[PDB]
Amino acid sequence: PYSPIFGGSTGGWLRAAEVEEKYAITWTSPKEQIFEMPTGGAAVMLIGENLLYLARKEQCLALGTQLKSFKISDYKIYRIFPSGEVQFLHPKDGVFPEKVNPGRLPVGNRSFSIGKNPNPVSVKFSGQGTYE
Amino acid sequence: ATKFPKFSQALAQDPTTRRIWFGIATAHDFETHDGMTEEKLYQKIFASHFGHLAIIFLWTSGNLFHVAWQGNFEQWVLNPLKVKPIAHTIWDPHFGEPAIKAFTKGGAFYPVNIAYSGVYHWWYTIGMRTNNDLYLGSIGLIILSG
Amino acid sequence: QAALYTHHQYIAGFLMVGAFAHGAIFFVRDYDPEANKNNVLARMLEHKEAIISHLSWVSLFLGFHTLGLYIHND
Amino acid sequence: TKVKILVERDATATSFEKWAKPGHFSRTLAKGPKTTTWIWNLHADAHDFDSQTNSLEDVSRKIFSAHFGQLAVIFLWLSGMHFHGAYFSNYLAWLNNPTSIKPSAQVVWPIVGQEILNADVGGNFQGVQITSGFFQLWRAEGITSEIQLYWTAIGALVMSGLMLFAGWFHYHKAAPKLEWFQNAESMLNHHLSILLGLGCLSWAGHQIHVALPINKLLDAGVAPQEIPLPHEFLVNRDLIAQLYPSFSKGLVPFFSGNWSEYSDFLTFKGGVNPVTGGLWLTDTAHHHLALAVLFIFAGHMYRTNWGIGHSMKEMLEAHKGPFTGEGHAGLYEILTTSWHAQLAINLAMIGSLSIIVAHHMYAMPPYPYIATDYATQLSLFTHHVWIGGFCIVGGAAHGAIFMVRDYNPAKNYNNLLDRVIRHRDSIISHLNWVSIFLGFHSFGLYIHNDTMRALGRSQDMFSDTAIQLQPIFAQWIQNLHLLAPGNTAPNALTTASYVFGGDVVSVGSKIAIMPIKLGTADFMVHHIHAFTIHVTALILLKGVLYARSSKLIPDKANLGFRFPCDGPGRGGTCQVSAWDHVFLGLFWMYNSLSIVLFHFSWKMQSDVWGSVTPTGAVSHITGGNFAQSAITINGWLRDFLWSQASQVIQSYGSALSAYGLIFLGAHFIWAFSLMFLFSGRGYWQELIESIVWAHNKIKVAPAIQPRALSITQGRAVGLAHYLLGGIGTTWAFFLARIISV
Amino acid sequence: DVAGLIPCNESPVFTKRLNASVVKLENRVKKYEAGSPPALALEQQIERTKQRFDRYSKSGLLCGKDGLPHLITDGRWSHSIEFVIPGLMFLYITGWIGWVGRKYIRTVGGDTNATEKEIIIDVPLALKIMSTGFIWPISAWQEYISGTLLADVSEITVSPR
Amino acid sequence: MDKGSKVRNLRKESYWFNEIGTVVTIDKSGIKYPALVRFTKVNYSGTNSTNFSLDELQEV
Amino acid sequence: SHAVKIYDTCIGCTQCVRACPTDVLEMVPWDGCKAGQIASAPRTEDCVGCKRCESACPTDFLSVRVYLGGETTRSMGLAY
Ligand code: CLA
Ligand code: CLA
Ligand code: CLA
Ligand code: CLA
Ligand code: CLA
Ligand code: CLA
Ligand code: CLA
Ligand SMILES: CC1=C(/C=C/C(C)=C/C=C/C(C)=C/C=C/C=C(C)/C=C/C=C(C)/C=C/C2=C(C)CCCC2(C)C)C(C)(C)CCC1
Ligand SMILES: CC1=C(/C=C/C(C)=C/C=C/C(C)=C/C=C/C=C(C)/C=C/C=C(C)/C=C/C2=C(C)CCCC2(C)C)C(C)(C)CCC1
Ligand SMILES: CC1=C(C/C=C(\C)CCC[C@H](C)CCC[C@H](C)CCCC(C)C)C(=O)c2ccccc2C1=O
Ligand code: SF4
Ligand code: SF4
């Protein structure tokens, strides 16, 4: 239906996509043009909405980078589970991670230089490394 | 728990064959085992050392038993310069007849390996003379390992 | 005799490599720089560059010249 | 007139200003050295023109003039060879008595006692015995004097100067425009009709007028002094009519169509000349004449300026079937817009052609007295085999480079390249299966034979006196080639080569060439060859196909052609680039060619090369121990390496001592390579940090900070030293084993 | 004397080696006409071999049971000629080299293009420095006692020092 | 301390530890590492400058 | 999953976020830097451990650091 015109390749997803998380990428193409598949050789993107399926988030983000840096197209990425659940992944709040977005909260932030971590001997026999 | 390596939850959750490989290579690193304390570490090391001593003594008892049961120790102590000490017999169904004839040496009457460990000279020096002495030593070592 | 000598020399090499490996492990996960302040062991790390550089010089000297003499004879 | 000459006058100014600014070509290196890595980069990107300019015209002008420079270097090398033959060689003495005199054209100054390397080759001469077969080549040309060699060297020097001047002129004075380069039809017409067509025609003329009569007189026993000069064979026709009484008729038969009258010196007898042990010169003359005709004909196939001809673009677009979508649509643009694609094809073809040359030259010795020169035959075979392997792997590497850089999916929609990339997984999986099958079966035959021989169960091995694996197909082909003369090649008097079957051609009591029988050992070794070739193809094809992307790295193309890794993520991502695939393929190519050379050497020493008695009895070098000893790994270790390595190890104190020294040096370099191959960059960087502290403590500190070799450079150095050590070891081994004779 | 070594002057094995070398060279030259360039080269080789063996006999080297000269390197002055004298020369030459190099490093180092002056040597300055190395020991000692030879502890290091 | 003043580095993890670098800019607008310093030698990454806090610099 | 940590030495240039292939990193408002932004690793379950973020870091020592740990299907770079 909305999938880009592709002749098929042996590099698509495999059984884990059916049994584990699969990924989908949607975008809008102003015109019809040829882009390189992360798996196969080449595919034609439809005018308007294009929906594509992949087995790894890295493939989706590589294709998104290709679109952004070559055809200046905005894109969205979702994760589909076998149970039917769908989760929105790449634009987490409608703005790319490079751009600052008020409301985000820091995660994994340490308030001291990297060289002030505790020694391994200090954290020993506890299920933790120096960074944690 | 939940998979092969209990001592590593991270490896237990690993879905690849890596879980197996590292499960072998992290076994004896008691420090890194989940929920490990100093006291349990020391006690496990102590028990492991007991096991290793048992292994060593069983290895020695095996050497003694094989020399006593299949060796030519008595013939060797009679004439220790010309005969070659025997290690153990060779029961290999893959051998061909010429191989069986070729590996028959020393005392003969069976295929045999010529011991290069020097255990014959050592046992002769320390005073052993008969296969009975070797057998008694091996039985004592088996009991010690138990 | 040959078997015994080779056997024990190889085991000695293995044991020495293991000793140094476990010393590296000790430094990684057992050393406490606060408890060894100005200690002999801490001073070992204090001038590690000198130790490593002079060891490298000795190794290069021996290798260069021994190999040179062997090739000269050849 | 679509095909036309276009040039730019004074394209580049000639000055030394750039010569004092190393790294000027690349934008990154032009800023000067901050660390020592810069230095290495300057020698690594020197000839990477595509990465220096974004314009194809500039890259094309650089390639053209670099090719001119290479031609100048080759001509200088030829000049040196010919000059050392004329002034420092015993060519005349060898001419007089080729069998006994050992060729030699190199002399060593006595400075440290190295004059021992001046062997007692013969002819009142002392020098290093050469194995380049130059003496046989010169004799085939009817040189017969050192003045001719001297003038050949002078001409080569002048040609080298002309090539240098042409390179300079075609870069800095008259640089052809890009449209000039993109003429595949015209270029092919000119390279086929003239370079290869008229080249063959001119060489055939030389042979008919110079080489043929001179070599015929030499075979008759005429001393070189009494042989008239070659120009004397061009002025008085009768002087040639005595040798070939068909010139008397002249050129009138040629134009009248009665070519049969030339059968005197244009023959099809084949086989080998019994006297010199080489191919008949008349056969080679007819061969080159026919090739000249064919090349001239084939050079008119492509359309250049007059309507008639073939347009390769239409030709490719026309070939498309149901299984391949768009067929060969877009390949012409690929091969006329990217030098890497063309270089890949050309290198693959040159390498395969070099290997074919190596195979054909030993089977049918083309030059006089080259067959019995066992040292020359072996050296030429191994040299050209190595060159062929290197060229094949280079073709693979440049195909990968094209895929990474010059591949454009927009212009390659659903064509052959697209479809190959789209079933690359199936291709690689099946190649992997066939490689494993070949390896298992072929090498397990050897392991099984070794195990059975060790267990005393000789009746259970894969040997002639045991379970037999006869190469029935090869034997059938040999029989057909044997029966060809008179039935399928009625006008050919003798078989193409005596390898297939026939008499034993021996010259001067030495077996020049004899039939080669194929047994179970030949079967096993041939399947070993196939296994190694399939594995090398696996590695290189996998590097080419997965050069742009993979299930690990969907965006590998952005990382470039050669990069160390993509980090320790996803498990580990070491050696994931196509350059690393070439790095491994070089090892596997070296292994396969080592096996090929060992097979050739042992088979020829044990089954072909040897001596004959007046009765006709044959005595080979190793007594035919190949059949019953080439079927186990221990047999190769003992009867080939250990047994034939006696010459090298015992060469000290003789003229071959240099070969023993090089044997040891090659072993040393091979072992040295393992230091780079096994170790990683971090250790060396930290060691260099300590050494830099030591230097700094004495206020010695280079402004160019030292750096450990990059990961890619570490691998490249390790591979280069590994190959040098292996090649040198086998070089010394073969040359000392085949010069003690 | 030293370790049961008999001087090569009275070593029968040494003379046997000399005779073997000469006789093998003579056997090699017997297959060339007198006066032929190969014959002259082989005769010159024979003469050079004889001179080498005579020089070794006259030098005072110590032979072994194998007849080859052996070197004594325990500091014995009577055998300094073997190792001590050449060693000094080496330590001089290399010393010179090293010193000169260091000076160049510390001369072009005080420039903005210090790196650019290492790939491209300032040949005039380079030769100026190179001509000064014959007094490298004195200059080195003067710098050592003047504190200009070694850098202070205030220099680059690593996290654990 | 001031623009263009030489400062000895004191950051233990820094590639230019115990080395002299020239101050390029100082941020008076708060910030934890406001003092930008530039060194002659390039680190392994090719950069030759870093931000330090005034506590991690010895003045001269 | 791997552990990604950002230290306060960060100068908020965004290069680490751009280099990330799995969209693990992002920019969040901050006040300890001139740019007013700092890197964060809210979703490290998608981190593969390629350490591209560390390679693309101007700060003397890697204000962004990656420590490899337990391996899952996502972090192991497996399409299967
Ligand atoms: C009694 C002495 C002793 C003791 C108690 C230990 C104990 C330990 N060592 Mg140390 N070590 C020793 C000797 C010792 N080692 C020696 C002699 C060496 C030098 C080789 C080392 C080198 C060493 C290193 C380099 C490391 C350790 C580590 C460790 C820890 C983990 C070991 C582990 O997981 O095993 C896993 C066990 C295996 C993977 C089994 C491998 C067995 C060998 C390699 C294969 C043999 C194949 C067989 C011979 C083939 C048959 C031949 C046939 C086909 C013909 C553990 C605390 C590791 C650590 O991190 O500790 C904190 C670590 O990194 N050790
Ligand atoms: C035969 C193999 C070989 C050789 C010669 C070396 C040589 C060396 N190794 Mg390596 N190494 C090897 C194998 C080898 N390694 C392997 C297989 C491993 C396991 C991965 C290692 C692992 C290793 C480590 C981890 C370390 C070494 C170190 C050393 C040095 C030891 C000190 C020494 O001998 O200085 C003398 C140097 C030599 C003998 C090298 C040859 C020098 C030649 C004779 C000079 C030739 C110059 C000539 C003009 C070249 C012209 C080239 C031109 C024609 C193109 C030296 C550079 C140590 C080191 O760096 O010490 C400072 C060190 O830390 N090596
Ligand atoms: C191209 C292939 C080739 C090769 C491999 C050789 C090799 C050899 N030749 Mg042959 N030769 C060649 C071509 C070749 N030559 C040609 C074309 C001619 C015709 C002119 C000759 C004429 C010739 C004669 C007449 C003789 C040789 C001799 C020799 C031997 C000693 C050469 C030597 O070291 O002398 C010493 C050479 C040097 C010390 C080289 C000079 C060093 C320069 C100055 C270094 C400059 C490098 C520079 C800094 C680089 C930057 C560029 C700069 C200019 C800007 C050697 C086996 C001699 C021989 O065999 O004696 C028995 C001998 O007598 N050759
Ligand atoms: C017809 C004349 C002729 C003659 C007398 C020779 C003679 C020779 N050739 Mg040559 N050769 C010829 C034509 C000829 N060749 C042509 C036309 C080709 C192109 C395929 C070749 C390709 C060739 C190769 C690749 C090699 C030789 C070799 C040899 C030598 C091997 C010994 C022998 O008995 O050769 C007998 C020769 C043959 C049995 C080959 C006959 C080939 C036939 C004529 C092919 C005809 C193709 C046909 C015209 C296609 C037309 C298509 C077109 C209309 C579209 C010998 C000197 C070998 C050599 O010198 O190695 C040292 C070698 O390796 N030949
Ligand atoms: C027609 C032949 C041909 C041509 C024109 C090129 C041209 C090129 N190649 Mg290709 N290549 C070829 C053959 C060729 N190659 C072959 C046969 C192989 C197989 C090994 C390769 C493998 C290859 C790889 C893997 C790569 C290239 C690359 C390149 C580019 C850069 C080359 C460069 O900077 O040189 C620099 C030259 C040197 C640094 C000289 C080193 C030469 C070797 C290592 C030493 C030689 C030793 C000597 C023979 C014997 C020493 C004796 C000892 C005792 C001293 C350039 C486009 C590189 C690239 O990125 O291109 C895009 C690249 O990554 N090529
Ligand atoms: C002599 C050492 C050696 C051996 C045996 C192998 C073996 C192999 N290599 Mg490796 N390789 C080696 C050295 C070696 N390599 C080195 C030094 C390099 C560095 C350049 C490489 C680099 C390399 C690459 C880059 C590639 C290979 C590939 C291969 C495979 C080729 C397919 C094959 O033959 O499968 C059959 C296996 C064998 C012939 C091994 C011997 C097995 C015998 C016959 C039977 C063993 C007994 C039996 C199992 C009994 C079972 C019971 C027992 C367990 C008790 C195979 C696994 C290729 C591959 O994997 O793809 C196909 C590949 O791509 N190798
Ligand atoms: C003039 C320059 C210079 C000076 C003064 C020194 C001085 C020293 N080096 Mg360093 N070194 C140098 C260049 C220099 N090196 C270069 C170019 C290399 C790279 C090959 C090294 C690699 C090196 C290592 C790996 C080690 C040393 C070590 C040492 C120390 C002991 C001596 C030694 O082992 O030499 C060894 C020298 C070499 C291995 C190569 C020297 C090559 C040439 C001869 C030197 C450069 C001369 C150059 C042309 C100067 C021209 C001046 C002109 C322009 C005016 C000593 C502090 C050792 C140490 O730390 O001891 C504590 C040590 O382990 N050096
Ligand atoms: C009586 C006498 C003698 C003797 C003397 C002597 C004095 C000897 C000595 C000897 C010795 C004296 C030896 C020693 C050796 C040493 C060693 C072998 C060491 C080692 C070390 C190590 C191994 C380390 C380790 C570690 C690490 C790594 C880190 C930290 C931790 C640790 C510590 C663990 C004689 C007869 C001769 C002479 C006369 C007199
Ligand atoms: C080795 C060499 C050399 C030399 C060489 C030479 C010397 C060569 C020559 C060559 C030659 C000398 C060639 C010639 C050629 C010729 C030709 C190729 C011809 C052709 C002709 C034709 C083709 C014709 C045609 C016709 C006629 C017959 C007339 C009528 C019509 C027509 C037109 C059809 C040198 C020393 C420098 C150096 C190194 C390299
Ligand atoms: C030894 C070694 C080094 C250190 C080696 C270095 C720095 C090379 C030193 C080269 C010297 C300084 C040049 C002189 C060498 C010879 C005397 C002759 C020149 C040889 C060619 C350069 C022409 C690495 O950096 C490395 C990096 C990655 C994997 C493996 C390794 C590795 O094995
Ligand atoms: S070991 Fe080296 S090549 Fe492998 S991932 Fe790490 S840095 Fe890259
Ligand atoms: S690359 Fe480094 S400095 Fe730049 S935003 Fe990321 S963590 Fe901060």
Side-chain angles (χ1 to χ4, degrees), chain D residues 34 685 689 705 707, chain F residues 15 41-44:
Chain D
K34 299 289 98 183
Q685 186 60 71
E689 289 169 6
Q705 292 176 91
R707 289 282 186 268
Chain F
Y15 177 89
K41 290 156 53 176
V42 300
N43 63 1
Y44 296 114

Side-chain angles (χ1 to χ4, degrees), chain D residues 540-558:
Chain D
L540 293 170
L541 181 62
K542 180 172 175 297
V544 167
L545 293 176
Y546 288 85
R548 288 191 62 80
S549 60
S550 174
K551 308 198 185 187
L552 262 180
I553 309 173
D555 55 356
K556 210 189 297 186
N558 304 333

Side-chain angles (χ1 to χ4, degrees), chain D residues 603-622:
Chain D
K603 185 67 176 183
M604 297 298 292
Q605 291 186 30
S606 187
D607 209 319
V608 180
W609 296 341
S611 297
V612 198
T613 63
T615 64
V618 168
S619 63
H620 293 137
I621 309 304
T622 61

Side-chain angles (χ1 to χ4, degrees), chain D residues 40 675-676 679-681 684 688 707-711 714-715:
Chain D
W40 303 121
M675 183 160 61
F676 303 86
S679 56
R681 187 187 173 282
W684 297 108
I688 292 169
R707 289 282 186 268
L709 308 177
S710 62
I711 301 165
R715 294 166 186 167

Side-chain angles (χ1 to χ4, degrees), chain D residues 525-605:
Chain D
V525 73
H526 275 85
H527 277 74
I528 291 293
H529 291 341
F531 162 57
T532 59
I533 294 170
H534 270 88
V535 177
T536 309
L538 169 54
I539 301 165
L540 293 170
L541 181 62
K542 180 172 175 297
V544 167
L545 293 176
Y546 288 85
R548 288 191 62 80
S549 60
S550 174
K551 308 198 185 187
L552 262 180
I553 309 173
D555 55 356
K556 210 189 297 186
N558 304 333
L559 289 160
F561 167 62
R562 73 180 180 268
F563 54 96
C565 67
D566 193 10
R570 306 177 279 266
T573 321
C574 308
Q575 295 181 5
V576 71
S577 65
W579 185 97
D580 309 308
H581 291 68
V582 178
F583 162 83
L584 302 167
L586 276 167
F587 287 102
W588 257 95
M589 150 275 179
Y590 161 86
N591 174 35
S592 75
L593 298 209
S594 301
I595 307 314
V596 176
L597 300 191
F598 290 179
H599 174 202
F600 169 85
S601 179
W602 196 2
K603 185 67 176 183
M604 297 298 292
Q605 291 186 30

